[PDB]
Design a protein around this nucleic acid. Sequence first.
DNA 1: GTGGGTCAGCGAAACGTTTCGCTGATGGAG
DNA 2: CTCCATCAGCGAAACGTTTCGCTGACCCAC
Lengths: 330, 330
Amino acid sequence: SATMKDVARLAGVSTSTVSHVINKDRFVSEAITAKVEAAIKELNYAPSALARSLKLNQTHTIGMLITASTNPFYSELVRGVERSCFERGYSLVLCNTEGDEQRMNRNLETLMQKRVDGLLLLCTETHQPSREIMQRYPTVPTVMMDWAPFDGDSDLIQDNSLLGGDLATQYLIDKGHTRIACITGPLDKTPARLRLEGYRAAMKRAGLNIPDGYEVTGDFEFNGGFDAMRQLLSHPLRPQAVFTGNDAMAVGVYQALYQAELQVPQDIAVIGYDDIELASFMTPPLTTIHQPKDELGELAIDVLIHRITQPTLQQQRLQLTPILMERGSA
Amino acid sequence: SATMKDVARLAGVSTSTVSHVINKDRFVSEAITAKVEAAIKELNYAPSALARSLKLNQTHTIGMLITASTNPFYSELVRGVERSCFERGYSLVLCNTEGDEQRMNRNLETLMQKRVDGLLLLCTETHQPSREIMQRYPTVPTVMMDWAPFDGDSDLIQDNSLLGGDLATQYLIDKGHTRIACITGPLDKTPARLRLEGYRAAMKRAGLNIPDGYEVTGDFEFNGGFDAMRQLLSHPLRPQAVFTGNDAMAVGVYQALYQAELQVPQDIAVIGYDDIELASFMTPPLTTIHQPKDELGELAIDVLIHRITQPTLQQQRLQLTPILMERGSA
DNA sequence: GTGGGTCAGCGAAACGTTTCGCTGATGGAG
DNA sequence: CTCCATCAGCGAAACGTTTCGCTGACCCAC
């Protein structure tokens, strides 16, 4: 392929001038410009962003780490991120940690080695990035949730899972339910833990007891919700209602109840978390805690770009407001 | 941060030697190796993949284009691609065309400018990549669905949607249904069109009529299926069964029927397409045509890397095998 | 004319890595 | 002693792009 050097040779000029024509960053005469443009079209010049990135030390690339699965939540989140990147002139490199910590650190190292301009750290997993790696490479603008903790510098977005869990439970309490169970995510994941504590707080505040087996762990996926609900149906004291740690698990709950020939909400009332697209299409439609997903992706990018633009800003800190979407499940 | 040059200076050696220590590509004496390793740890050397890529003319990066949405199919596909990339030492750049053609071409140009080693072109929309762009940049290994015509040279995957649609309809015919409708995707998308033709073929072969309003278009999404089914419920002749273009649309169908207080399969039998994870958790569980998703992602990468490794090879053509999963919906 | 001054545009270095000729040392067959 | 054949490791070019110090062509107060 033709380089700016090949262009310059044919137009009989310096590569400096070729750069200036292309970038419009320093005055070049109309004649010279025309010659260069002719040479570009003639040779069919194919610019290398790679080579530009090396010299400029910026790639217009964002790296994103997630802990993804069949949970539709992350699909909507990624959609928002990718769209926002495109609109802002950035590429998206996607990494799935898949729970594994070495995998996560290996992903991170690759991203830093490829000199991404910014980082979305949206892993849920307990682990935090090897500081060895972190402090080896130049610091980059970073956004993370309160999900994954971390010792370095980053802008922060808090999901307020605790208030969400409280709100969800409080809603069931306000509907008059007193036997309320909680299907949670893996308790080593912060959002799962916080939602459980929200549930506990609302129950305690209303003086309602939590039977021994009323808190059950699932995996934040369909199957986890299925398994957990089956277990709950074994309990001596049948729940009137269940708060599931997310919408994915609620899908599994629906399936368990279908198999047990139980109706929602007539036999059991259900409330989820996330308000994924699917929630609205469930039968009955799922009452749930709305959290930003696509919108969250867009917000995280906006934060990240603000910092790229103004590198010396103080730490940015945002919080989401959980909101209840009332439908037919509770 | 330290470069291989800084390392070389401290260890008092050539950068050639430093490269050889790091890459293990030519013999270096044990003493030299040790000194270099010490220098690496001492300076805390941070390798640049950027700089390596420029010199090597390879980025160990794959670009992937999809026409994504809420459709869970693409979530599972991307998961397979990303995992396969990771296992093979590649990064994944993800692009969503969102149907738009200029957006698609803009994505392509960025990827080529960043010199990705390979392309996964898994857009459903009909447009062809601007040849201007294509023939401007160095040609790269490419895998695409056998949907769009000649469009340069690249490896191909046939999904066998036509035989799938035929099989799905034939199944309903074999269950004794005679009034069978078809909810399809946008007919400008090849898999949607092919599935419709499959339906037509099976109907014709059995000599069953297709009433005028029995073929309805939606977008390959929950709400497309919802809208399309509502329309079908308006038809003077109510269908006994419906083949939906994919599982996403079947979700919408379920929701429409729920609102019309109609039961599956008692009032209407339903059969979908992808066998997404969710299919088996639906109420009732969805009868559908299985096709590879995660496994498709893995296969596409394997093909792409085989070509990177052996550029000599002539066009690969792979075919997927649809499998019918009989469940409770039909 | 004419010595001095302005700025377009020159040649070319260099972001950090891989690759390449080249050399000097060492090793066995005279 | 020759000398001839191998390879370890050096110094540094160079992938393709910006960026810099310098020049020289043209305008202008003498």
